Amino acid sequence: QNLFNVEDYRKLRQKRLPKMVYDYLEGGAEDEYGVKHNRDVFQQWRFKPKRLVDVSRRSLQAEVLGKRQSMPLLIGPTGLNGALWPKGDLALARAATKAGIPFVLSTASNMSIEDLARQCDGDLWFQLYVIHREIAQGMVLKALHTGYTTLVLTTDVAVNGYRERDLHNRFKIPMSYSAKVVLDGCLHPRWSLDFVRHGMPQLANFVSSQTSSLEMQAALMSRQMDASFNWEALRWLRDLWPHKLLVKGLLSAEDADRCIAEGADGVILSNHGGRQLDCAISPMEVLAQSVAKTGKPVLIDSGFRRGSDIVKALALGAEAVLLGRATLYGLAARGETGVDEVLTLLKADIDRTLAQIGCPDITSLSPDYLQNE
Amino acid sequence: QNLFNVEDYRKLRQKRLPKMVYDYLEGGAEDEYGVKHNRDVFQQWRFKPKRLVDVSRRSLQAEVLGKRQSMPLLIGPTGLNGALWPKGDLALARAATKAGIPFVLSTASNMSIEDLARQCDGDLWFQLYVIHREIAQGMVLKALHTGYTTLVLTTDVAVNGYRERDLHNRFKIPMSYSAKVVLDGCLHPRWSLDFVRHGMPQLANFVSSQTSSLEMQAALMSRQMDASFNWEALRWLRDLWPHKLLVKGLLSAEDADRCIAEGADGVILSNHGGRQLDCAISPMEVLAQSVAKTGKPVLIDSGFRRGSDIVKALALGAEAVLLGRATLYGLAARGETGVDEVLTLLKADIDRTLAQIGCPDITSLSPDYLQNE
Amino acid sequence: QNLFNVEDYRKLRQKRLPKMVYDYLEGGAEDEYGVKHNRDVFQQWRFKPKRLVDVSRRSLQAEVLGKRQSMPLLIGPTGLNGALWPKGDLALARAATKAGIPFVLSTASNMSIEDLARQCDGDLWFQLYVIHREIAQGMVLKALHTGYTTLVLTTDVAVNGYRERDLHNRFKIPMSYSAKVVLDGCLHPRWSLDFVRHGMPQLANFVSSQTSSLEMQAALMSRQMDASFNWEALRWLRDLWPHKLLVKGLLSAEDADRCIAEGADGVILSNHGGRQLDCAISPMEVLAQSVAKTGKPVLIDSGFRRGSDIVKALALGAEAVLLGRATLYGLAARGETGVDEVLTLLKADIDRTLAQIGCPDITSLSPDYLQNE
Amino acid sequence: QNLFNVEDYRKLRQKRLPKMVYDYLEGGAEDEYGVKHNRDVFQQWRFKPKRLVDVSRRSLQAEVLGKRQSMPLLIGPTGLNGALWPKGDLALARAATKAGIPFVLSTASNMSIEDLARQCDGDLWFQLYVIHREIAQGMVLKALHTGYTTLVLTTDVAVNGYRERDLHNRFKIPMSYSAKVVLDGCLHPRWSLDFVRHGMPQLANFVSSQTSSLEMQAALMSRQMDASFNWEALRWLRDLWPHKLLVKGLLSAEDADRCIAEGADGVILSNHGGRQLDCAISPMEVLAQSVAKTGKPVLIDSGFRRGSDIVKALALGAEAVLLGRATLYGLAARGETGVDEVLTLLKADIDRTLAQIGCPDITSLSPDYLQNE
């Protein structure tokens, strides 16, 4: 284990995964100015430590939507985790659970709402795309009836982002074979062996006797995307769903406030990890405004790789941070154990950062610890 | 092939064109800080999407100078397109009309005012350089009588810009042969064959028994450039031309306002794609100001390569964007089909961008969708 | 040789030291954005020279904590200098005294408090880490009774910084052998020979019959670090120590002011040379503010390599600058002579800088000689 | 002649000159952040052209210190031009004269005050270092008696800058032979042949039967530098010199104003081409302030390579721009003809720039043509 940070796991993923799958994981939209901006924006703050503060007893635990967890991270929703590691959705969820944090299941998961709730008893969240009311109500109810605590509505994939790595690779659900496909698979024998042994992953929440192939399932899922979803549909969802409701994919304090007005319990500021709109702002640019404007839980993702990144968001008011690629690196490098190791480092990293800035209780973070640069 | 954006066609044009011709198309003035700045300035804005907006039915069509077109782009005027592809002016013109947008013919075209109007029935514009009243009145009249709808006066080539790529290549109108020339032509057989079969392109609006070679046509054209053209000459032109009149090459709101005061119907903010003055501002720096100061159509060019670039200019108030090199890459790679394809990508790209930022009708764009950085 | 500045000695140290030891000396925390920022920040000021000032007689001497020295530098505290050169602590100490400046011995030195005082008669300072009162009182007392004039309390190593060079190299106190270790030692025969002849360096202030190996000494030292050290413990130390007391590792004027309030004689602004917290501010960002807020001696370190760096800190109000790596490069390249030489270059460099900016007496420096940029 | 700008001549110099001489010409002080800043600062302004202005008749001529010249450039003072080209001082002066502009002779020239006035009838300036009154009065009077019109006092070389290229090369007046010297001379046969044919250049203003070698002359010149020269000595000089007096090497409006108060007719803002103090401001940073503060001629140098650079200084108020390296490139590349060609380009370049920004009369330049960026 010569692995000391998230980036060491990224490097390991790139060796195990075929170029085509790594490009699906790593790529962003168009020129990828956005993913770069998602990282660079964190250099806009530096730390002003408070010295001679007793930090001998540190606590990372905190309340997210009124419920205590061991640190303010979550494993956020990502589709097709089964391309990365067998039963990857369950790997992630078990690691989140051992680490004391929630896991968010994707509409596009390779393991169904119900199979995951049957095999793991952590705090499971479900994320729903913007889709047409009928089959949406079908998923929401399966999540209700199996004990999912909070529902996430992702609003930033009405239409698909223009990801040119996937276009250059021809990475699309009807795959077939190719000079490049076979070659890519052959130079990555560990993954290909895993792939033959276990088979093509399925869009498990679209499976049935009648839609029994991936090509069939994806076609159904894209037919269900609803680019007309508006504030009215959100009220419909608020009324259908009795527990915690969050709106994901927002990039303004104004939309954040409107979501709360229509009944949301909180929001997730996000640009989908730079995968949807290359020239979108980072959510860090509207965090403090959205926190000040709403007074309700503001969570955030997009670009987080280091404990200092996370700490900066928490000091500006964020209730918690969702990990996408960071823990996905652990998954495809080393499976469920990889995810455990990444969360173990990030916890140690957050904990070390709190020590060095003189703030022993994570809930007492504030901009006072930041220099604006 | 793998052609998914404008840059992929640049790569393709660079392979087909001989180095000297590629350098005439691509180059800018002196150090080329200006062409660089023309691209970089677009990073001064990022997008704040509005979510939970119905974007299932999008419209790109808009009024330019009171006339509806399918999207707010134009193929702007560029000279010597016949160096890029046989009958290059008509190719560009036929593609613009299929796509539903105007095409602007250059004073320096390889096909004459009249011959283009006899071969294309789109919305044709004519651009006139600052030149001496006599032969200017001649071209203006040919254009009026052949049904051109709009006249644009280009005001930024009083003197020739200092383009050091052409100087180092010895790319000048008395060409002759050389070790390098022949070598360049021989390494580009598709283009050289096209050139041998079809001959030396000619300045078609300067052809006559007396100026029967390209050298004589260019000698005449540069002797006709009139660095004294002032506000008086503009009024003279305004009285001579009864239809829509635009002034191109402005880089201040004050000059824009004066152009409107002297009867112009609108302006084109431009620095000639960085080809005339390396240290000129980008026209994006004075776009919002010119829109507020004149209240008349403000169009713009210089630097546009991505749909996101175009959308940012439209949200700051521009009526439309003219393309120079972007559609010239398609022309020089694959002719009229290449041009079609580039316009097809840019229309889809603009449309996708509108979807992602939550603005379904292009006419409702505003700075509200922008963050200034 | 061709040794004309500090960087030339870095190049020389890098050739003699094995890669693992060079990485312990050179490395910083995590991404090393901090060490980079420590250098770059000096570019935020440029010089406005005053001309037609008589600068024929220049003086570098100045009062630090009321005591005259030949120039306003100190060799600050660094641990494990014996890894760089035999008797490295004494070499540094003997060179400082020849140059007329204090030397600060580290808690983590390879030569004991008492043995250094028996072998050098300069102005010796002792730096104490934040540790448990019992053995702290022991070292403080050894230093008082052996004639140390100043005590500095380093407050920024509650927890160890995350230095990934050492982790990737497996550079840890239970070392052992390896393919890479032996290879590294064999490619650096001068250093390896020195190491074989002289043995494993020891934490000399933690030596006893029971902690008779380096592993045991380091085990003891890290168990003695006291993350609870607070303002109360500082008063305790203030009463225990009768002479000059400084607090090192501060990064705010507010903490500086509190340190003065609790009896300290001055402070050292520091981020431990970027080794503890990658995203910490440079202390130059809070230098002028700390000087104005306390009105007491404000010293500084972190990033200094050029005489111009030093002069800029002095014009903003700093009483003196401590050197870490700069004089360690001289030590590891050429021992006590290397250290002498580096101090000789830096004194000449400071003196030349004063000549060029028209300020003949170092004590009259002021921001008036600076432009903020 | 494939030479279209100053940089093409720099490239040519580097091939003809031995590395050691090129490094003396090109190098700056220490890290050479200063020369880089001297270039980069010009990117802080861009141009806002005025359109539809009659620029058919352009004039470059202007008054410098009340005397008309053909363009507001000067060839400024540089020592050891005879290392670059035989009788280089006379080459430069003849080119300045054919181009209609003054030439400034250096104290450190390879041709004496009197020999140059005997062989060229242009507008000759003399620059004097800060030196001890006696031999200074000897040079000032020779310049007076031979018709030099203006005297320049250079105040920024009290002590020598720390130029590490010269230190690495051992480029010092007692040269001798060496592995590197002979090798350098052998790989540059054109220059070495020139050097044997004509001999070691001499500090011609320090020549006599008694100080008849370069080693003797340089020793005398460095003994005469007077780091005590102050405002009193300046008044002495003002009284000794009856014609125009300028003070060179200033970097503040305050010193500029003081020079005028003590009788100077104007100042030259300069940092000696980045050769004296790496971290000095560019003089462009205090140009507009010095122009506004004094109301007397403010000239400038340091960093000028392009006509746009020059134009920007003139629009901020500068009376004229002195060239150092720019015309020295022409000299060592191609002798007197090289200097002619460089000035011909720069005139064409200034003239083209005025056309493109719509300002036909150079005296009507103003900040109105600039955008601050």
Ligand SMILES: CCCCCCCCCCCCO[C@@H]1O[C@H](CO)[C@@H](O[C@H]2O[C@H](CO)[C@@H](O)[C@H](O)[C@H]2O)[C@H](O)[C@H]1O
């Ligand atoms: C405009 C909208 C377009 C829709 C965009 C949809 C993009 C989604 C990408 C679909 C990829 C389907 O995910 C599927 O995963 C399987 C197993 O995990 C992998 O399987 C495939 O890739 C590997 C690459 O070496 C090959 O060895 C294998 O033979 C091939 O079938 C691919 O990853 C893909 O077949």
Ligand SMILES: CCCCCCCCCCCCO[C@@H]1O[C@H](CO)[C@@H](O[C@H]2O[C@H](CO)[C@@H](O)[C@H](O)[C@H]2O)[C@H](O)[C@H]1O
């Ligand atoms: C601290 C202050 C130090 C004082 C600084 C003084 C630096 C000044 C540099 C002095 C160089 C004297 O300039 C003199 O020029 C002659 C002819 O032009 C050149 O002559 C020399 O260089 C060339 C290099 O190839 C050799 O071939 C030749 O044999 C050698 O003598 C050198 O340039 C130098 O000898």
Ligand SMILES: Cc1cc2nc3c(=O)[nH]c(=O)nc-3n(C[C@H](O)[C@H](O)[C@H](O)COP(=O)(O)O)c2cc1C
């Ligand atoms: C491969 C991949 C698949 C994703 N799938 C989904 C998804 O199915 N549903 C969703 O709401 N967000 C999805 N996301 C977005 C993440 O939830 C999250 O917003 C993003 O990854 C955070 O950016 P980061 O990767 O830099 O941490 C996906 C992200 C990636 C990288």
Ligand SMILES: Cc1cc2nc3c(=O)[nH]c(=O)nc-3n(C[C@H](O)[C@H](O)[C@H](O)COP(=O)(O)O)c2cc1C
């Ligand atoms: C090869 C080339 C030729 C051009 N010729 C003309 C021209 O003849 N008349 C004109 O008004 N503008 C001309 N232009 C400028 C363009 O009309 C347009 O202003 C510029 O290309 C826009 O910048 P862009 O290439 O970055 O899109 C030319 C540009 C290029 C690159």
Ligand SMILES: Cc1cc2nc3c(=O)[nH]c(=O)nc-3n(C[C@H](O)[C@H](O)[C@H](O)COP(=O)(O)O)c2cc1C
């Ligand atoms: C190898 C090394 C060891 C150090 N050891 C100590 C130490 O033991 N105690 C301490 O207070 N500071 C220690 N420091 C920090 C230095 O005292 C000083 O604050 C820092 O080196 C200044 O930055 P600079 O290297 O850029 O000059 C150490 C620094 C280095 C590089």
Ligand SMILES: Cc1cc2nc3c(=O)[nH]c(=O)nc-3n(C[C@H](O)[C@H](O)[C@H](O)COP(=O)(O)O)c2cc1C
């Ligand atoms: C090789 C060289 C020698 C110089 N010698 C002198 C000199 O003897 N006296 C003087 O006043 N300035 C001298 N200068 C400074 C120039 O006069 C001028 O200030 C500087 O070169 C302008 O910067 P630039 O080279 O970027 O144009 C010298 C500059 C160079 C590069």
Ligand code: NA
């Ligand atoms: Na299910």
Ligand code: NA
């Ligand atoms: Na003389």
